[PDB]
Design a protein around this ligand. Structure first.
Ligand SMILES: Cc1ccnc2c1NC(=O)c1cccnc1N2C1CC1
Ligand SMILES: [Mg+2]
Lengths: 523, 401
């Protein structure tokens, strides 16, 4: 029998003392039947009237017959129980698995029911069964095993399972086993017959510890539906997504669809939600009906089509390299695909995240690369060799001019438009014969010129970019600009190609136009 | 074993483990597997909710991997224990030895062991991940050097009296051996230590097995452009910079330079410097030749280290406690951005350790995800300074060079 894990109540706290609520004689009966049985199987044990602790229990009728199910409420005991090493918080991504010939899933019944509970802790699991007799005292028990609903059960159960699988795993290095709550996925490259046989060996091993699982006739067969995916032994996808067909969409519908569409983009390349997303602007209620714009309709129809023919994801082949490829799919929009075999995707995806109010494609692309790198380490434990639509020289250039440090692993240029580049660059030195504008809501040029404007509904730092803006307009191809604003400077110095505020974008336009622009700062 | 405790009221660390590469994981598995065989660590169960992050780093001039446990959180939560050689910095040359292994021969208070829990993750969450806790004193823990100080004095007793010409300082897992002797006669007195330390798995040399030469560690004054002709622009940059350094050296004047710049002139227009002005500049130059007076090290204040990228593989830093009140300033030069930044941080930490005996708090110019992703690839120190990530402005950087 498996080792006992030492449990304790949180510091200073004492066990639960919650009175058992009134129970119908019909429930009193069914419980005593369920409990008396549990006492025979050793799962619980009658205790002396010395135990001041108690946890209420009541009965539920599992929609079947009249037979009742026992439910013990451990909220209080849970509040008073120590924290355990958090159960499996992370999960595997299908794209990180290696294909198998056969994969078998097994359900484990009476999981907690077959695992010891630390002796010094059982006295806190004390509960009571009100006797039907009026003058008579009800019967009080305590648990001898992991109780359903208790805080540490999930963790202590997994820990045990892992120790129970240890041997079987060493004797069978060729078999892969994934534990997920009460299921066990077991895969191998064994011939059909051999596989089924091993599965039977495992079943016996688990049964030796009183762990019951389903036989061949009752086991679920691939593909398996897990965490939103549809899994086969050789390929994976996301479970079937159906785009509603209608003409009256509410904010609720749009949000659910965009959510659904998002999940799909990890395998279906080309999914777009830009237009659909715009429908949510200024919405007043979840039930407010929003008409689909001609472009939203276009978008929905295209997704509908991409989703019509299922695409599958191939599994990881650790013998081959991971290739990551990125494409700019619109302003602030990127898409990527990770594969090993030319064009046979393990997974795809898109990046639309914008870090900071202003930015350029070079930054965004670099961030996409970081995000993909992080992700790959999690799924495959190594970084992919990148295929990027940016030339070495372009990158290397922005690299040195940016104050912040960064790094991009192995990567080769890929001449696949649109290529990312810098739309403009500030001179490193003032221009000769290029007029000089001194801005401060107006400006004064060295050649005598000037202009002052008044601005309503404007922020202090917004009037600063206005001036700079004005100057770019009235100036010629080459222009030197002097300002006191460190803010504007920073913004422009970062050479953004896209922004949130129109102002900046209008400035960027001017900037892209000029032959030579130099910006300076003065206090 | 000594009864160690966490600072009152405080509970153990529960730090998230940053995803690792299959390479650093394989390494940590091989390593921890062996530490288990030698009873240094033990597998633990779910009843232990604590966690400290671990990494695998490469050893310089060795093919082996080092296990780096980030006990930073645990160390802030460990109780305080109750001297720094003002002369170690004066010494001409200092060698750094990794004496971390000395600890592996000392049990850890049974009731503290739980606080040293760490996890060896698995790729893509295939499996729950291997959990351990320490049985002996863990390398990197604030308590280890302390709880071993005695046994360490008792051991550095003979070499101390044998060679009272070479000052020996210990910091966490590192030992700083300082002298003035000749490089050969020095490196020789070092090896004589390595044999006297082995006398009680040899303590390798950190930092290339090389010396540091603490004497040369210079403060880098603020510099002003020395030019032939001065354009309106040059002067404007001159004043802005002067104005800034005026905050520190109040004797700086620009009044006379601001005169060359009256009206609205062309940025490129060359301006001869009036007599009055030329003299005021020469004077400002004189003032910046040395660090501002009255800036002392407060042992009760945290040391801050700020780094700026100059480009072309060149960085600049400043160690202070109060704004502008710099205790030190330096530069570093060549790899890639991250590799350099990491090599910098460690350099500044070693110095900060040597000069004051405590690691500084860095303010790094990089995205956390980028840093978290690559730093372990070039890190070689046994310690890990505290750090945060920032966005340096164009001007500050523009005022160093
Ligand atoms: C849900 C899950 C999580 C982790 N691994 C797997 C699975 N399920 C599978 O069906 C699967 C499919 C293909 C390869 N490995 C798989 N398995 C491994 C166990 C054989
Ligand atoms: Mg001005």
């Amino acid at each position: 029998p498996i080792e006992t894990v030492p449990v304790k109540l949180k510091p200073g706290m004492d066990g639960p003392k919650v009175k058992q609520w009134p129970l119908t004689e019909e429930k009193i009966k069914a419980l005593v039947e369920i409990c008396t049985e549990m006492e025979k199987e050793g799962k619980i044990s009658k205790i002396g009237p010395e135990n001041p602790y108690n946890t209420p229990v009541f009965a539920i009728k599992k929609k079947d017959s009249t037979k009742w199910r026992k439910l013990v409420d451990f909220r209080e005991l849970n509040k008073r129980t120590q924290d355990f090493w958090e159960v499996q918080l992370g999960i595997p991504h299908p794209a990180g698995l290696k294909k198998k010939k056969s994969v078998t899933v097994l359900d484990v019944g009476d999981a907690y029911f077959s695992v010891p509970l630390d002796e010094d802790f059982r006295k806190y699991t004390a509960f009571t069964i009100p006797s039907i007799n009026n003058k008579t005292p009800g019967i009080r028990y305590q648990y001898n095993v992991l109780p359903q609903g208790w805080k540490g059960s999930p963790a202590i159960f997994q820990s045990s399972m892992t120790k129970i699988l240890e041997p079987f795993r060493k004797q069978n290095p060729d078999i892969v086993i994934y534990q997920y709550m009460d299921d066990l996925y077991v895969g191998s490259d064994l011939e059909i017959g051999q596989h089924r046989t091993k599965i039977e060996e495992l079943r016996q091993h688990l049964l030796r510890w009183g762990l019951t699982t389903p036989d061949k006739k009752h086991q679920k067969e691939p593909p398996f539906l897990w965490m939103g995916y549809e899994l086969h032994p050789d390929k994976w996808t996301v479970q079937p997504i159906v785009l509603p067909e209608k003409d009256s969409w509410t904010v609720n519908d749009i949000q659910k669809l965009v959510g659904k569409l998002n999940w799909a983009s990890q395998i279906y390349p080309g999914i777009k939600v830009r237009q659909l997303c715009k429908l949510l602007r200024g919405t007043k209620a979840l039930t407010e009906v929003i008409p689909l714009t001609e472009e939203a309709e276009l978008e929905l129809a295209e997704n509908r089509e991409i989703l019509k023919e299922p695409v599958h994801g191939v599994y990881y082949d650790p013998s081959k390299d991971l290739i990551a490829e990125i494409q700019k799919q619109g302003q602030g929009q990127w898409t990527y695909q990770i594969y090993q075999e030319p064009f046979k995707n393990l997974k795809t995806g898109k990046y639309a995240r914008m870090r900071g109010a202003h930015t350029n494609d070079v930054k965004q692309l670099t961030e996409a690369v970081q995000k993909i790198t992080t992700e790959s380490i999690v799924i495959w434990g190594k970084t992919p060799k990148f295929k990027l639509p940016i030339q070495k020289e372009t990158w290397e250039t922005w690299w040195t001019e940016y104050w912040q440090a960064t790094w991009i692993p192995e990567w080769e240029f890929v001449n696949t438009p649109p290529l990312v580049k810098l739309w403009y660059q500030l001179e490193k030195e003032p221009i000769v014969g290029a007029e000089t504008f001194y801005v401060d809501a107006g400006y004064v040029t060295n050649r005598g010129r000037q202009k002052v404007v008044t601005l309503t509904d404007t922020t202090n730092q917004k009037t600063e970019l206005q001036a700079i803006y004005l100057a770019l307009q009235d100036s010629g191809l080459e222009v030197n600009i002097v300002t006191d604003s460190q803010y504007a400077l920073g913004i422009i110095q970062a050479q953004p190609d896209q922004s949130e505020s129109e102002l900046v974008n209008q400035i960027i336009e001017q900037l892209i136009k000029k032959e030579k622009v130099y910006l300076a700062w003065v206090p | 074993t000594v009864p160690v405790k966490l600072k009152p009221g405080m509970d153990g660390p529960k730090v998230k483990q940053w995803p690792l590469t299959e390479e650093k994981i394989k390494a940590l598995v091989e390593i921890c597997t062996e530490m288990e065989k030698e009873g240094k660590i033990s597998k633990i169960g779910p009843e232990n909710p604590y966690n400290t992050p671990v990494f695998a780093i490469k050893k310089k001039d060795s093919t082996k991997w080092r296990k780096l446990v980030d006990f930073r959180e645990l160390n802030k939560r460990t109780q305080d224990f109750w001297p720094h050689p003002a002369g170690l910095k004066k010494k001409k040359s200092v060698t750094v030895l990794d004496v971390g292994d000395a600890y592996f021969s000392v049990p850890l208070d049974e009731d503290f062991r739980k606080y040293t829990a760490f996890t060896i993750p698995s790729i893509n969450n295939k499996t729950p991940g291997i959990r351990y806790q320490y049985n002996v004193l863990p390398q990197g823990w604030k308590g280890s050097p302390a709880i071993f100080q005695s046994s360490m004095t008792k051991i550095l007793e003979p070499f101390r009296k044998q060679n009272p010409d070479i000052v020996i300082y210990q910091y966490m897992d590192d030992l700083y051996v300082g002298s003035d002797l000749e490089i050969g006669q020095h490196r020789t007195k070092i090896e004589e230590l390595r044999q006297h330390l082995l006398r009680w798995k040899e303590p390798p040399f950190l930092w290339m097995g090389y010396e540091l030469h603490p004497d040369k560690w210079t403060v880098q004054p603020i510099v002003l452009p020395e030019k032939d002709s001065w354009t309106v622009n040059d002067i404007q940059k001159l004043v802005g910079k002067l104005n800034w350094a005026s905050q520190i050296y109040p004797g700086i004047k620009v009044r006379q330079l601001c005169k060359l710049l009256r009206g609205t002139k062309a940025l490129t227009e060359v301006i001869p410097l009036t007599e009055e002005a030329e003299l005021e500049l020469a004077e400002n130059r004189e003032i910046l030749k040395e660090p501002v007076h009255g800036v002392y090290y407060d042992p009760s204040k945290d040391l801050i280290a700020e780094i700026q990228k100059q480009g072309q593989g060149q960085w600049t830093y400043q160690i202070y406690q109060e704004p502008f009140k710099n205790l030190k300033t330096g530069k570093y030069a060549r790899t890639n951005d991250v590799k350099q930044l990491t090599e910098a941080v460690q350099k500044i930490t070693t110095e900060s350790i040597v000069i004051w005996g405590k690691t500084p708090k860095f303010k790094l110019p990089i995205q956390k995800e980028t840093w978290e992703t690559w730093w372990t690839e070039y890190w070689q120190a046994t310690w890990i300074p505290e750090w945060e990530f920032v966005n340096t402005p164009p001007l500050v950087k523009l005022w160093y060079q």
